[PDB]
Design a protein around this ligand. Sequence first.
Ligand SMILES: N[C@@H](CCCC(=O)N[C@@H]1C(=O)N2[C@@H]1S[C@H](CO)[C@@H]2C(=O)O)C(=O)O
Ligand SMILES: [Fe+2]
Length: 321
Amino acid sequence: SVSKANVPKIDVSPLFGDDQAAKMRVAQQIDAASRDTGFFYAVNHGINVQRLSQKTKEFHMSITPEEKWDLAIRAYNKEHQDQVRAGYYLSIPGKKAVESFCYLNPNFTPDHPRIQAKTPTHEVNVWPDETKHPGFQDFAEQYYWDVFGLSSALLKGYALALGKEENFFARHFKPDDTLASVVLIRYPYLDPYPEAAIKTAADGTKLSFEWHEDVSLITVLYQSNVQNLQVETAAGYQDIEADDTGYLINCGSYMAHLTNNYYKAPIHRVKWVNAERQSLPFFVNLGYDSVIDPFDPREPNGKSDREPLSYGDYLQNGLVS
Ligand SMILES: N[C@@H](CCCC(=O)N[C@@H]1C(=O)N2[C@@H]1S[C@H](CO)[C@@H]2C(=O)O)C(=O)O
Ligand SMILES: [Fe+2]
Protein backbone atom coordinates (compact mmCIF):
# COMPACT_ATOMS: atom_id res chain seq x y z
CA SER A 1 0.00 0.00 0.00
CA VAL A 2 0.81 3.68 -0.08
CA SER A 3 2.85 5.26 2.74
CA LYS A 4 1.17 8.03 4.79
CA ALA A 5 2.47 11.56 4.07
CA ASN A 6 3.88 13.60 6.93
CA VAL A 7 1.25 16.30 7.31
CA PRO A 8 1.67 17.91 10.74
CA LYS A 9 -1.06 19.63 12.66
CA ILE A 10 0.00 23.17 13.47
CA ASP A 11 -1.83 25.31 16.00
CA VAL A 12 -2.03 28.60 14.13
CA SER A 13 -3.86 30.46 16.87
CA PRO A 14 -0.78 32.57 17.80
CA LEU A 15 -0.85 34.14 14.32
CA PHE A 16 -4.02 36.02 15.32
CA GLY A 17 -2.36 37.58 18.42
CA ASP A 18 0.57 39.73 19.58
CA ASP A 19 2.98 37.18 21.08
CA GLN A 20 5.84 37.55 18.60
CA ALA A 21 8.02 34.67 19.85
CA ALA A 22 5.02 32.35 19.79
CA LYS A 23 4.40 33.45 16.18
CA MET A 24 8.03 32.58 15.38
CA ARG A 25 7.54 29.07 16.77
CA VAL A 26 4.49 28.69 14.44
CA ALA A 27 6.57 30.06 11.52
CA GLN A 28 9.22 27.41 12.18
CA GLN A 29 6.60 24.68 11.90
CA ILE A 30 5.34 26.18 8.65
CA ASP A 31 8.91 26.31 7.33
CA ALA A 32 9.49 22.66 8.20
CA ALA A 33 6.27 21.46 6.61
CA SER A 34 6.89 23.58 3.52
CA ARG A 35 10.35 22.12 3.06
CA ASP A 36 9.12 18.51 3.64
CA THR A 37 5.91 17.31 1.92
CA GLY A 38 4.55 20.82 1.40
CA PHE A 39 1.34 20.18 3.36
CA PHE A 40 0.16 20.83 6.89
CA TYR A 41 -3.13 21.03 8.75
CA ALA A 42 -3.96 24.36 10.35
CA VAL A 43 -5.78 23.69 13.61
CA ASN A 44 -7.27 26.07 16.20
CA HIS A 45 -8.19 28.29 13.22
CA GLY A 46 -11.40 29.67 14.67
CA ILE A 47 -13.71 28.87 11.75
CA ASN A 48 -16.97 26.94 12.19
CA VAL A 49 -16.29 24.27 9.57
CA GLN A 50 -19.21 22.03 10.54
CA ARG A 51 -21.61 24.88 9.76
CA LEU A 52 -19.73 25.51 6.48
CA SER A 53 -20.21 21.88 5.57
CA GLN A 54 -23.88 21.91 6.52
CA LYS A 55 -24.76 25.08 4.58
CA THR A 56 -22.80 23.82 1.56
CA LYS A 57 -24.61 20.46 1.66
CA GLU A 58 -27.98 22.23 1.84
CA PHE A 59 -27.04 24.14 -1.30
CA HIS A 60 -25.62 21.25 -3.32
CA MET A 61 -28.51 18.97 -2.49
CA SER A 62 -31.28 21.47 -3.20
CA ILE A 63 -30.10 23.22 -6.37
CA THR A 64 -32.06 22.10 -9.47
CA PRO A 65 -30.98 21.55 -13.08
CA GLU A 66 -32.84 24.73 -14.04
CA GLU A 67 -30.83 26.79 -11.55
CA LYS A 68 -27.55 25.22 -12.63
CA TRP A 69 -28.07 26.34 -16.28
CA ASP A 70 -29.06 29.79 -15.01
CA LEU A 71 -25.81 30.08 -12.99
CA ALA A 72 -23.56 28.17 -15.45
CA ILE A 73 -20.13 29.43 -16.52
CA ARG A 74 -19.61 29.93 -20.24
CA ALA A 75 -18.04 26.48 -20.79
CA TYR A 76 -21.58 25.15 -20.19
CA ASN A 77 -23.79 28.07 -21.26
CA LYS A 78 -22.83 30.19 -24.27
CA GLU A 79 -25.23 32.97 -23.12
CA HIS A 80 -22.91 33.70 -20.20
CA GLN A 81 -19.82 35.05 -21.94
CA ASP A 82 -18.81 37.17 -18.87
CA GLN A 83 -18.68 34.08 -16.60
CA VAL A 84 -15.28 32.48 -16.98
CA ARG A 85 -14.52 31.93 -13.27
CA ALA A 86 -17.65 32.60 -11.21
CA GLY A 87 -20.76 30.43 -11.36
CA TYR A 88 -21.82 26.82 -11.65
CA TYR A 89 -19.68 24.08 -13.16
CA LEU A 90 -22.10 21.33 -14.16
CA SER A 91 -21.69 17.55 -13.89
CA ILE A 92 -22.31 15.52 -17.00
CA PRO A 93 -24.17 12.33 -15.91
CA GLY A 94 -22.56 9.21 -17.34
CA LYS A 95 -19.32 11.19 -18.00
CA LYS A 96 -18.17 13.82 -15.45
CA ALA A 97 -19.13 13.24 -11.86
CA VAL A 98 -17.92 16.38 -10.09
CA GLU A 99 -19.82 19.66 -10.00
CA SER A 100 -18.98 22.93 -8.28
CA PHE A 101 -19.92 26.53 -7.61
CA CYS A 102 -17.24 29.22 -7.63
CA TYR A 103 -17.40 32.72 -6.28
CA LEU A 104 -14.97 35.61 -6.04
CA ASN A 105 -14.45 38.72 -3.90
CA PRO A 106 -17.91 40.05 -2.85
CA ASN A 107 -16.49 43.56 -3.33
CA PHE A 108 -16.37 42.94 -7.14
CA THR A 109 -19.62 44.78 -7.70
CA PRO A 110 -20.75 46.44 -10.94
CA ASP A 111 -19.21 49.78 -9.80
CA HIS A 112 -15.82 48.31 -8.84
CA PRO A 113 -13.12 50.00 -10.99
CA ARG A 114 -11.72 46.65 -12.23
CA ILE A 115 -15.21 45.46 -13.20
CA GLN A 116 -15.85 48.78 -14.98
CA ALA A 117 -12.55 48.36 -16.87
CA LYS A 118 -13.39 44.73 -17.68
CA THR A 119 -10.01 43.68 -16.36
CA PRO A 120 -9.31 39.96 -16.92
CA THR A 121 -9.97 37.61 -13.95
CA HIS A 122 -12.45 40.01 -12.30
CA GLU A 123 -16.16 39.13 -12.42
CA VAL A 124 -19.28 39.94 -10.48
CA ASN A 125 -20.54 36.92 -8.61
CA VAL A 126 -23.77 35.16 -9.60
CA TRP A 127 -26.15 33.80 -6.99
CA PRO A 128 -29.21 31.57 -6.88
CA ASP A 129 -32.62 33.00 -6.06
CA GLU A 130 -32.81 34.01 -2.41
CA THR A 131 -36.29 32.49 -1.95
CA LYS A 132 -35.05 29.07 -3.17
CA HIS A 133 -31.84 29.24 -1.12
CA PRO A 134 -32.60 31.43 1.88
CA GLY A 135 -29.51 32.76 3.61
CA PHE A 136 -27.06 31.08 1.24
CA GLN A 137 -25.58 34.19 -0.37
CA ASP A 138 -25.14 35.91 2.99
CA PHE A 139 -23.58 32.80 4.47
CA ALA A 140 -21.21 32.34 1.52
CA GLU A 141 -20.09 35.98 1.54
CA GLN A 142 -19.46 35.85 5.32
CA TYR A 143 -17.48 32.62 4.77
CA TYR A 144 -15.30 34.41 2.23
CA TRP A 145 -14.34 36.98 4.88
CA ASP A 146 -13.86 34.32 7.61
CA VAL A 147 -11.46 32.33 5.41
CA PHE A 148 -9.86 35.59 4.22
CA GLY A 149 -9.04 36.30 7.84
CA LEU A 150 -7.53 32.86 8.43
CA SER A 151 -5.54 33.25 5.22
CA SER A 152 -4.17 36.65 6.26
CA ALA A 153 -2.97 35.09 9.51
CA LEU A 154 -1.36 32.17 7.62
CA LEU A 155 0.38 34.60 5.26
CA LYS A 156 1.94 36.28 8.33
CA GLY A 157 3.30 32.85 9.35
CA TYR A 158 4.73 32.24 5.83
CA ALA A 159 6.37 35.67 5.84
CA LEU A 160 8.03 35.05 9.20
CA ALA A 161 9.08 31.55 8.06
CA LEU A 162 10.94 33.06 5.08
CA GLY A 163 12.80 35.63 7.19
CA LYS A 164 10.56 38.57 6.22
CA GLU A 165 8.43 41.03 8.21
CA GLU A 166 4.97 39.59 8.90
CA ASN A 167 3.13 41.80 6.38
CA PHE A 168 5.40 40.78 3.44
CA PHE A 169 2.58 38.88 1.70
CA ALA A 170 -0.43 40.17 3.61
CA ARG A 171 0.09 43.75 2.48
CA HIS A 172 -0.83 42.54 -1.05
CA PHE A 173 -3.88 40.60 0.18
CA LYS A 174 -6.60 43.18 0.63
CA PRO A 175 -10.40 43.03 0.78
CA ASP A 176 -10.90 45.67 -1.93
CA ASP A 177 -8.93 43.86 -4.61
CA THR A 178 -8.06 40.25 -3.82
CA LEU A 179 -8.50 37.81 -6.68
CA ALA A 180 -9.07 34.95 -4.17
CA SER A 181 -11.81 32.43 -4.97
CA VAL A 182 -13.96 29.95 -3.07
CA VAL A 183 -15.01 26.76 -4.83
CA LEU A 184 -17.72 24.55 -3.39
CA ILE A 185 -17.01 21.19 -5.00
CA ARG A 186 -19.41 18.28 -4.77
CA TYR A 187 -18.03 14.76 -5.28
CA PRO A 188 -21.07 12.49 -5.55
CA TYR A 189 -21.81 8.92 -4.62
CA LEU A 190 -22.93 7.19 -7.81
CA ASP A 191 -24.10 3.62 -8.39
CA PRO A 192 -22.98 2.70 -10.90
CA TYR A 193 -20.08 5.12 -11.11
CA PRO A 194 -19.30 6.36 -14.67
CA GLU A 195 -15.94 4.90 -15.84
CA ALA A 196 -15.50 7.96 -18.01
CA ALA A 197 -15.25 10.04 -14.78
CA ILE A 198 -12.45 7.83 -13.50
CA LYS A 199 -8.93 8.38 -14.67
CA THR A 200 -6.11 5.88 -14.06
CA ALA A 201 -2.59 7.11 -13.19
CA ALA A 202 0.60 5.59 -14.57
CA ASP A 203 1.08 3.75 -11.26
CA GLY A 204 -2.41 2.13 -11.49
CA THR A 205 -4.18 4.41 -9.02
CA LYS A 206 -7.77 5.30 -9.90
CA LEU A 207 -8.19 9.10 -9.88
CA SER A 208 -10.86 11.75 -10.04
CA PHE A 209 -8.22 14.39 -10.89
CA GLU A 210 -4.67 13.97 -12.21
CA TRP A 211 -1.50 15.49 -10.84
CA HIS A 212 -1.21 19.24 -10.63
CA GLU A 213 0.34 22.17 -8.85
CA ASP A 214 -2.13 24.74 -7.51
CA VAL A 215 -2.63 28.14 -9.14
CA SER A 216 -2.40 30.20 -5.98
CA LEU A 217 0.00 31.82 -3.52
CA ILE A 218 -1.32 29.32 -0.93
CA THR A 219 -4.43 27.08 -0.88
CA VAL A 220 -6.62 26.84 2.25
CA LEU A 221 -8.81 23.73 1.95
CA TYR A 222 -11.61 22.16 3.93
CA GLN A 223 -12.61 18.60 2.98
CA SER A 224 -14.94 15.95 4.34
CA ASN A 225 -13.48 13.14 6.38
CA VAL A 226 -12.89 10.77 3.46
CA GLN A 227 -9.26 10.18 2.53
CA ASN A 228 -8.54 11.05 -1.12
CA LEU A 229 -5.55 13.36 -1.64
CA GLN A 230 -2.04 12.21 -2.45
CA VAL A 231 1.24 14.12 -2.64
CA GLU A 232 4.23 13.23 -4.77
CA THR A 233 7.43 12.90 -2.75
CA ALA A 234 10.82 11.32 -3.50
CA ALA A 235 9.33 8.15 -1.93
CA GLY A 236 6.55 8.27 -4.59
CA TYR A 237 2.92 9.30 -4.03
CA GLN A 238 1.87 9.26 -0.37
CA ASP A 239 -1.63 9.47 1.16
CA ILE A 240 -2.67 12.67 2.91
CA GLU A 241 -4.85 11.76 5.89
CA ALA A 242 -8.25 13.42 6.10
CA ASP A 243 -9.10 15.77 8.95
CA ASP A 244 -12.47 17.49 8.71
CA THR A 245 -11.68 19.70 11.75
CA GLY A 246 -8.67 21.36 10.17
CA TYR A 247 -7.70 23.26 7.07
CA LEU A 248 -5.22 21.56 4.75
CA ILE A 249 -2.67 24.17 3.64
CA ASN A 250 -0.16 24.07 0.79
CA CYS A 251 1.78 26.46 -1.45
CA GLY A 252 0.84 27.23 -5.02
CA SER A 253 3.14 27.95 -7.91
CA TYR A 254 3.26 31.72 -7.26
CA MET A 255 4.95 30.95 -3.90
CA ALA A 256 7.37 28.63 -5.67
CA HIS A 257 8.21 31.37 -8.16
CA LEU A 258 8.78 34.02 -5.42
CA THR A 259 10.99 31.73 -3.32
CA ASN A 260 12.93 30.15 -6.26
CA ASN A 261 11.37 26.80 -5.37
CA TYR A 262 12.59 26.91 -1.78
CA TYR A 263 8.89 26.48 -0.90
CA LYS A 264 7.81 24.22 -3.73
CA ALA A 265 4.28 23.99 -4.94
CA PRO A 266 3.71 20.28 -4.19
CA ILE A 267 2.40 18.03 -6.93
CA HIS A 268 -0.76 16.36 -5.76
CA ARG A 269 -3.74 14.45 -7.12
CA VAL A 270 -7.21 13.32 -6.12
CA LYS A 271 -7.97 9.58 -5.76
CA TRP A 272 -11.28 8.30 -6.99
CA VAL A 273 -13.52 7.41 -4.03
CA ASN A 274 -17.17 6.46 -4.50
CA ALA A 275 -18.47 8.62 -1.65
CA GLU A 276 -20.63 11.69 -1.23
CA ARG A 277 -18.21 14.34 -0.09
CA GLN A 278 -17.07 17.96 -0.20
CA SER A 279 -13.91 19.74 -1.26
CA LEU A 280 -14.03 23.47 -0.41
CA PRO A 281 -10.81 25.23 -1.42
CA PHE A 282 -10.02 28.92 -0.91
CA PHE A 283 -7.35 29.94 -3.39
CA VAL A 284 -5.32 32.71 -1.87
CA ASN A 285 -4.63 35.11 -4.72
CA LEU A 286 -3.24 38.66 -4.45
CA GLY A 287 -4.34 41.69 -6.43
CA TYR A 288 -4.16 42.11 -10.19
CA ASP A 289 -1.21 44.51 -10.01
CA SER A 290 0.54 42.86 -7.04
CA VAL A 291 4.22 42.16 -7.65
CA ILE A 292 6.58 40.66 -5.14
CA ASP A 293 10.21 40.68 -6.21
CA PRO A 294 11.47 37.10 -6.41
CA PHE A 295 14.12 36.10 -3.88
CA ASP A 296 16.06 33.03 -2.81
CA PRO A 297 16.29 32.25 0.93
CA ARG A 298 19.06 29.69 0.29
CA GLU A 299 21.45 32.37 -0.98
CA PRO A 300 23.44 34.61 1.36
CA ASN A 301 22.40 37.76 -0.63
CA GLY A 302 18.84 36.49 -1.11
CA LYS A 303 19.03 37.27 -4.86
CA SER A 304 17.13 35.26 -7.47
CA ASP A 305 17.54 35.04 -11.30
CA ARG A 306 13.77 34.94 -11.78
CA GLU A 307 11.86 37.79 -13.38
CA PRO A 308 9.14 39.59 -11.42
CA LEU A 309 5.67 38.50 -12.43
CA SER A 310 2.50 40.37 -11.52
CA TYR A 311 -0.19 38.33 -9.84
CA GLY A 312 -2.72 39.15 -12.56
CA ASP A 313 -0.35 37.86 -15.29
CA TYR A 314 0.35 34.73 -13.21
CA LEU A 315 -3.35 34.06 -12.67
CA GLN A 316 -4.53 34.67 -16.25
CA ASN A 317 -1.77 32.37 -17.53
CA GLY A 318 -2.44 29.70 -14.91
CA LEU A 319 -6.22 29.52 -15.26
CA VAL A 320 -5.91 28.89 -19.02
CA SER A 321 -3.25 26.24 -18.41
N1 LIG B 1 -12.30 28.21 -10.55
C1 LIG B 1 -11.18 28.68 -9.75
C2 LIG B 1 -9.88 27.88 -9.88
C3 LIG B 1 -10.15 26.39 -9.60
C4 LIG B 1 -8.89 25.51 -9.73
C5 LIG B 1 -9.27 24.05 -9.67
O1 LIG B 1 -10.17 23.59 -10.38
N2 LIG B 1 -8.57 23.29 -8.79
C6 LIG B 1 -8.62 21.85 -8.81
C7 LIG B 1 -9.95 21.14 -8.46
O2 LIG B 1 -11.06 21.08 -8.92
N3 LIG B 1 -9.40 20.48 -7.35
C8 LIG B 1 -8.08 21.10 -7.56
S1 LIG B 1 -7.78 21.95 -6.00
C9 LIG B 1 -8.63 20.60 -5.04
C10 LIG B 1 -7.72 19.39 -4.78
O3 LIG B 1 -6.40 19.44 -5.30
C11 LIG B 1 -9.86 20.27 -5.97
C12 LIG B 1 -10.45 18.95 -5.77
O4 LIG B 1 -10.78 18.38 -6.98
O5 LIG B 1 -10.73 18.43 -4.70
C13 LIG B 1 -10.94 30.17 -10.01
O6 LIG B 1 -11.32 30.80 -10.95
O7 LIG B 1 -10.21 30.72 -9.04
FE1 LIG C 1 -4.79 21.05 -5.87
